[PDB]
Amino acid sequence: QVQLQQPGAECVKPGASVKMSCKASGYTFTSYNMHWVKQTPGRGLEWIGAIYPGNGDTSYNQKFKGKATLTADKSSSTAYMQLSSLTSEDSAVYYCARSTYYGGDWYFNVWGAGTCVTVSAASTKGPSVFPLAPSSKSTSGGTAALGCLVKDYFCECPVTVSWNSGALTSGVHTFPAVLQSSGLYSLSSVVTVPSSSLGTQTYICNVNHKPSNTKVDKKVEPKSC
Amino acid sequence: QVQLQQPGAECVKPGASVKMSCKASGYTFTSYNMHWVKQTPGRGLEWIGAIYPGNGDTSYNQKFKGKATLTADKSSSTAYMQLSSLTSEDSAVYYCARSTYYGGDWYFNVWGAGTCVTVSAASTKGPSVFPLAPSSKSTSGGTAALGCLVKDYFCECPVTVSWNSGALTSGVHTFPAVLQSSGLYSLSSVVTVPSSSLGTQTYICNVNHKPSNTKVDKKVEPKSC
Amino acid sequence: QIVLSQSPAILSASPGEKVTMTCRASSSVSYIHWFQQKCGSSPKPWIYATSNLASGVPVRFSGSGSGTSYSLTISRVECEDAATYYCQQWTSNPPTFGGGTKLEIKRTVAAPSVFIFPPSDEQLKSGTASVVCLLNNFYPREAKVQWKVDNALQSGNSQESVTCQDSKDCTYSLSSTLTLSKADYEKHKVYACEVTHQGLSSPVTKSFNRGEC
Amino acid sequence: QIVLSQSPAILSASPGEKVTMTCRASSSVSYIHWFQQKCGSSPKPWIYATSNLASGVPVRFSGSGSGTSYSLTISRVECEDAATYYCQQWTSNPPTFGGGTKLEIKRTVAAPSVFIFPPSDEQLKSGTASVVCLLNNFYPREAKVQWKVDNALQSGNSQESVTCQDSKDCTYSLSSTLTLSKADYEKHKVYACEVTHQGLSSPVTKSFNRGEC
Amino acid sequence: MRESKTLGAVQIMNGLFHIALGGLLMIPAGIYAPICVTVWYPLWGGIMYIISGSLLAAVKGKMIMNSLSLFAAISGMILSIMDILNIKISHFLKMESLNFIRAHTPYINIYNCEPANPSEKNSPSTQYCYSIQSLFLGILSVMLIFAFFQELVIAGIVENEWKRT
Amino acid sequence: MRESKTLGAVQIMNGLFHIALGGLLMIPAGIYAPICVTVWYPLWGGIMYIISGSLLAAVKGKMIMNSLSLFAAISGMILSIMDILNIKISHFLKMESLNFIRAHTPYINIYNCEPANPSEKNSPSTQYCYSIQSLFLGILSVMLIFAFFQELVIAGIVENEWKRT
Q1: Which residue ranges are recorded for the region named Epitope 2 (chains E, F)?
Q2: Chain E closest CA to C101's CA: distance in Å?
Q3: Nearest C-alpha of chain A: how many angstroms from C134?
């Protein structure tokens, strides 16, 4: 029902600017404050500012009052934040959040998925996706593991990986991406399945990299060595 | 979904006291203020007071601060108002209403149906329900009218009347009750129907008078003269 | 404690006319809220925060104002709009409501469908006879019902009751109830109500003989 | 501007143990709100107005406190509770969050299911070979993966990556990726990863010959 | 009294501080003001205590000036008593303030601070209201005790004036 | 100056006005107080202007008392300048008030009144906050102009003191 939709990743150049949206749905968009919150592992969660889309009033955190520029469109029911003059320190996950007044205080009662922003000079290489094909090498106890190695992408913002278009979710492990000595990021995702299933079932890993529009699918099975 | 349920009528003696309930449903009862509002034709709508069921805090209109006593039960999820020392001027419809904070102000966004209270010394006579049986006398233009006369009840709070247990609602007119020279109230309700329907269809008027538990049903048809 | 003054106290407009009704606060208030009440309903929230329509309120409505002077306006009125509208303020404890503006709609004239009901046998077994004359779906409100009994002219011993304006149709219905003792009802034979209304080119009468079915 | 200080920064408890985590505000605040975040999720509202559980939060949780000192406490912890909890205040502009308390659960030891994957032909056509060793569903986190190549001992040229604690199971998974040139991969024949972990009575090794299917 | 030089300074100072408290009490604070503000007592009463500084220049005017200043002191002490009761027992005289002051505080009042929504009893909004009500009680009781101070010193003069005349 | 009787009254009145403004400025108003309150300037500075009333009893103590009062006047004028900037350009010195005063205002501040929720810019809650901030600006600027008044009169004395000594 009530839901905030955000673009999952933006990969941007220093000194440039980025505009990220937050599509509201399932509620009267103009009747609530839309807040923006920064998250970084070194600083935790920092509130950036808010807009009331009804009139258009904004308030900003003083430490952001020239970085962010909040706007809202009543018609598409979308809030926006522009970040100016981007720097390494603007690399973060940015959440939109809708504050209600409830229980006797303000309350961030619904959150967007977050937009990963990373600010970097280097160009956004798309991932190369390789099958971790299962075999007796990867068989143990009657289960077998299989996976996809999503190698050598760039921009830290993770490639989203799913299995069988999301129809397979038990036993799926997607690992944190590692920065390689090449400066490119690599990720892998694995799933453990009944070894008998490897014959009749076909397992697809779906890889998507919005920063380079790189949608990929690979078929992983012991029908290849 | 969100709904406040109230007992539809209370008929009470002067100097007595009455407790009326407001059953909340479909929302976190303790997270909102419950307000009580008086209505009388000579004074309009008067706010009585509110309770926050979370802790139990109350506030009252100064002109009610000794008439009303608001309470709430967290477990049954029911607000209550006690009225002391009842007088003729306490005869009113009493609404519970739930205030949210929304659009930048407080907002009575859901209301109860209201409890009719009338304060009177006389005893609550139950209604006598008589068929206004249709005939050519009441046939015109190929429609025919039929109805029920709900005579000689007491306490002004209206008898609720429905047709076919609520399955018939088009063409139903229920008139305001008239105070008779006997001091008792009379009401009638009528429905206009296709005259051809009077043969195959049977029309039931359902009369209910909670103040005397007087549930009644009558069958109205030209099979009686 | 703030007095909210609504003008006019009664408003009328033909279907598709434009109306405005005003709320004037004794002292300025942050917002005014408007509630619609129909006969026998609770108030419905209609406008909140001066200008926001409540869920399902037709965009036919709008609200505006600031400070001490607020208004609700309807671009083109419809028969479903016939109601009493209350302004309301939260800016001071206690919250307070305006006196209401009753909107009733100048629809086209409609003649009453006139019906007459004999006293039922159930009631005569109680010794009382009530004769009901029904005027269905008429406009305007100024109907008159004259009871006649063997063409003698009744007075005092009858009561009118009339609905609110039908939100589907802008018409009214009215019932007149003649009341008699069983000994009075069983003297006379011919009972009639005669109805004069603007929709009738001459007074219609509906009657029955006592005894026939 | 108010600093919210959370203690401890990292918390651990065995399943069914009782925990409390505290939020200390640099000034008194009307209420504290708690948010739960899991890895890769947005924050979820968890407690509002100091003590009210959010929709679907287990009554296993409760929140308490006043003034400058607040706490969240869990009667009996479960593996789904493993998360970072942030307190948050609205009493001053800007609203602010605590540093978080990371709760991880002392489940019973579990040995890693060890798997090894050869470089695919797709990758060798690119001139690079990555060998992946997978440790599945183990606890505690202190696994070690030692790569061996014709029993020569590898170092530096591999990277570990490890999941967050599984909210269903409190275990971890880890992948180690050995990376080689195609010319290096096609010299040696026997590739192995050797895993030491507390769940293993002796170091398990998984290997493959280069060439066999 | 012979100290009339020392006393005339006291009157002038009581005048200036009434004017300062008046301007402070005229700072926008909502729909209703204290009666002292709408009577303008601290302005006209303050300058009257400046004008009785005429006795520092040590005629029937001065007898009138001293007597006129005594009426101001008495009336001010009564007015400030009234407003403290107006604030703390019952808002019995609803002095509609001044519209050029209401312009900055058009939606707000301090003669009631109980919220209609009991959840808000804890709220910062409610603490702000009681803060201004407490400040106005403070300003009025400070103005009262200096208004009472005028009565004492003017009595120490006019008690001699009419016995000299 | 010869008017030292008339001037000694002025000093005493400036003392009482500071004490009254101090108690008024000590009325509960939130987390942070003005520096003047936490320095207790209106209390110790006020009574120092009472004590320089020693010169109404027209020794090296009095030279010290007058010189000590001049430091209080200067320091008070600086402190009240600081707090007006503390209120209106930047809360640069976050004087944590007094806990027996915070007890009545524990969840509240007046050094920021912009709401984090822009819908509330219209709200009565926001107007209450700006009302207290405006009252504190008023009280401080009134205390400043009387603190400046002390400097003028003490200068008119100590300029003669050290030239006599």
Answers
A1: 92-106
A2: 24
A3: 47
